[PDB]
Symmetry: C3
Subunit: 256 residues, 3 copies
Amino acid sequence: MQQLQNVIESAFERRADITPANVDTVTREAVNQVIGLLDSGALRVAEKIDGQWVTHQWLKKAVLLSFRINDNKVMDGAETRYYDKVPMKFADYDEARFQKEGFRVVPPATVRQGAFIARNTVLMPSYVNIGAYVDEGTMVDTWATVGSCAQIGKNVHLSGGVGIGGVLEPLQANPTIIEDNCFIGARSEVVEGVIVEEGSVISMGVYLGQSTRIYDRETGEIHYGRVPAGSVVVSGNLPSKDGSYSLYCAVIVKKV
Amino acid sequence: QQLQNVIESAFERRADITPANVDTVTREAVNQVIGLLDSGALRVAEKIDGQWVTHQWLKKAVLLSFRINDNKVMDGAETRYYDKVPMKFADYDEARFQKEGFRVVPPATVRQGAFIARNTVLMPSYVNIGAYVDEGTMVDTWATVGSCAQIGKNVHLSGGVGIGGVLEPLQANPTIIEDNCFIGARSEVVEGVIVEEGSVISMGVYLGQSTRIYDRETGEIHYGRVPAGSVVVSGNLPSKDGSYSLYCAVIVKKV
Amino acid sequence: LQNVIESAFERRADITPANVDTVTREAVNQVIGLLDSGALRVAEKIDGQWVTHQWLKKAVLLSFRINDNKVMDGAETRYYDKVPMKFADYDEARFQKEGFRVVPPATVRQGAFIARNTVLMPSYVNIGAYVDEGTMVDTWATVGSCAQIGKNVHLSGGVGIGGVLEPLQANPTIIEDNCFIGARSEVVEGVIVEEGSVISMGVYLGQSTRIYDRETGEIHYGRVPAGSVVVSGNLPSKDGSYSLYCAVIVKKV
């Protein structure tokens, strides 16, 4: 909504002066409502429009505000205790609910309220942060991480130990995006708003950040920030002029 | 073999079986096999005449357990889960723990159907179904022992190490880490690769079926297997025109 | 305290949870509570130099000897270990007073100090560790045994900071103030990352890792000079037939 957006926006500018104590009823109710929409996948931080990914800045503002209006609470672990201000997405789920939503949650996988998980999805022990969106039939392997506002497409395989970087600030920047049917090999990391295009295959040990050189062995071209669809990517190195040493890089070995 | 026949029969008809229609006998057979796997009486792969052999039927049993069981809500304390594979230590008492001989550091988790041997230390980590972890082994923080994987005695699995599970293909052998091997932090060993006894793998080594393993000594290239006593480190091999280089594992010394 | 510990250490083999003497148990318990609260620390900076207090390492090792394994109730599961949970008895007020955050399911062992303004995302902090003010620990990161983490340090996701109990001589892994460690990187075996350094992703630093200074052609071992900007690389073999991993300092801030 609009008044919803207005409320979020005005409050955001006053963020520094807001406390769980002083917050006004309208702000509060506004933020809470937006979080619920993110959680149910009604709204989403980034989306694909006319072949392009666009970010809803105000949605980023709502998530940030949520950190200001909520106070840290003691959370009862069993053998231990926690202390945080973001609630667990499944704290109140029941058998009926789980059945309806159609995904699996293997202990001790944990998800923050404010993240959406689609049907046919399997969460092995892992972590899903607030504002993330995980689409249908995706498999999240052991010890993987889906950071804030991250967008995970359909039929994605995030192998074990895989990290998907979160992106809140700057507000302008798109989150990290993994398109449909992508395969991400174990121990790989995709962060900082890098976009991995549809049907791509990333092998093990591949680290992709905004500064990673993506060498196209075919063209001899270097790309940054994005992995073209159908790419087959592996780790490698690029030599120095004198060849006395070489530096890490990702290589597109083949295009499907 | 009754047990085995029952498993094999059911498998052929997996498609038509459900947690509802499955018959008394099949259910019992499967539960029974899972229990044997859980206690180490049976194992997915074993050494025979010096070579690793895989028992497909055991894989079938595991796969069948997924089909006859239903997802259930599991109460975490702060959260809730929903899965069909029970926890191995849910009914354990002190007596049992004491008898079994290993340590489980919170929040380490193990799925029922996996064998943990005495003198083993599990730091926070995950051990999946059908795995076998032998004596005096150390599993560090955030490591993973995948399905059906075989870990020998006195093995050290450093932090963040992943050992790839292999259910299917049925015929594929699981990932095996032989006795007395050392695996460095952040290494990954997957797809049925076999790491021979007494090997030392350093940090950041990724071994899968297509990983070239370069013997700097002889200049050969091995695949799917690390010969006993090898010291392996991460490296790269150059392109024909030297404009770039690709990832590889290098054998720098054989102890 | 120190004298008792050293004395007890010498007789370590004669000590078990079954017969540990009164004085020895008391002292070890006291020392662990001191580490836990930051009153003592394994390694400290004195006159520009990091010094290791072996007697503290000795105290930790004894704690393991004098204590028995106990069943620990998990909700859906059970555990069996001999080191207690730091936060098991915490209450709101304590958490409030201490001023740090613990995101489920991050876990901390008793004997580890966590300072004010710290944020622990799901991670693990082993015994004897020291985590200074305003540090951020990301998801699936590990702060190993006796490790010293400075103020305003950012430990990225999946980062492992290696523990160092034994050898007793060895100083623990040290991460100075204002350091940034990139995702999936690993610093172990007592390597010292000096203040203000930036480590990119997938960098593995051990005592044997060659830390190549592209500018000077110098190679460091076990230490990252202050203000370094480090990335992964490789050094070619004499012939040029293959190359081997290394860390490269590409610039100094």
